Amino acid sequence: QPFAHLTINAASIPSGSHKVTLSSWYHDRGWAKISNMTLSNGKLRVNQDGFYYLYANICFRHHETSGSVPTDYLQLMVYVVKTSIKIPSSHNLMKGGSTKNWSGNSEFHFYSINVGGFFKLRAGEEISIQVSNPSLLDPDQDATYFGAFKVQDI
């Protein structure tokens, strides 16, 4: 059956603050793997109908530079998006995260988000990950990844 476990591609990670689509993942190294699904710049395309279980783990991290601001109210969020094929439409399957105050009092900061769901997918539909503050992403394969594996037929 079809599956996928895509780990973040460090080399390609935007340096912004607002929402962005993570458009670069590994699919054939370390734990990264893909079967009967296709990947193209962050978009995981479904080839075979079925009920899939979808999951995503995202880790944020940062180091406060000497002489940091008294406060830094961040929104660390993840969104798992599905793009329909039979009709142009993008919608959030799942979303998670939290607000954080990563001021300068604490030198280091870490935080990870985990979302998981059971959804009905069709061939042609694409799955993509969206996050805020992508510049704070942890590049490790055990830290930032998302996957999917078919469980039942439709």
Partner 1 sequence: YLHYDPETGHQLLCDKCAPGTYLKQHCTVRRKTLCVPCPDHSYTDSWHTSDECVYCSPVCKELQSVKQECNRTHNRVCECEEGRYLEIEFCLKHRSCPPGSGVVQAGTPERNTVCKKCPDGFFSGETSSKAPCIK
Residue span 23-42 as binding mask against partner 1, x where in contact by CB under 8 A, dash where not:
------xxx-----------
Residue 29 touches Cl ion, criterion: CB under 5 A: yes
Out of 53, 64, 68, 122, the only residue in the binding site for a copy of itself (CB under 8 A) is 53
Short-list 28, 54, 24, CA closest to 41 = 24
Query: How many helical (H) and strand (E) elements, i.e. helices and strands, does the chain have?
Result: 0, 12
**Closest distance to Cl ion from the beta carbon of 57 (Å):** 17
**Closest distance to partner 1 from the beta carbon of 154 (Å):** 12
How far is it between the farthest Cα atoms of the chain? 57
Residue 5 touches a copy of itself, criterion: CB under 8 A: yes
Question: Residues 2 to 21: which contact partner 1 by CB under 8 A?
Answer: 10, 18-19
Alpha carbon distance, N-terminus to C-terminus of the chain:
14
Residue 44 touches a copy of itself, criterion: CB under 8 A: no
Distance CA 134, CA 89 (A): 24
Phi then psi dihedrals of residue 90, to 5 deg: -120, 130
| Both structure tokens of 53 | 């279980």
3-class DSSP assignment, residue 78? strand
* 25 vs 60 by CB, closer to Cl ion: 25
Identify residue 119 by its one-letter amino acid code. F
Question: Residues 100 to 139: which contact partner 1 by CB under 8 A?
Answer: 107-108, 110, 132, 139
CB 146 within 8 A of CB 55: yes
Q: Give the footprint of a copy of itself on this chain (CB under 8 A).
A: 1, 3-5, 31, 33, 51, 53, 55, 57, 59, 71, 73, 75, 77, 79-80, 91-99, 101, 105-106, 108-120, 140, 142-143, 145, 147-149, 151-152
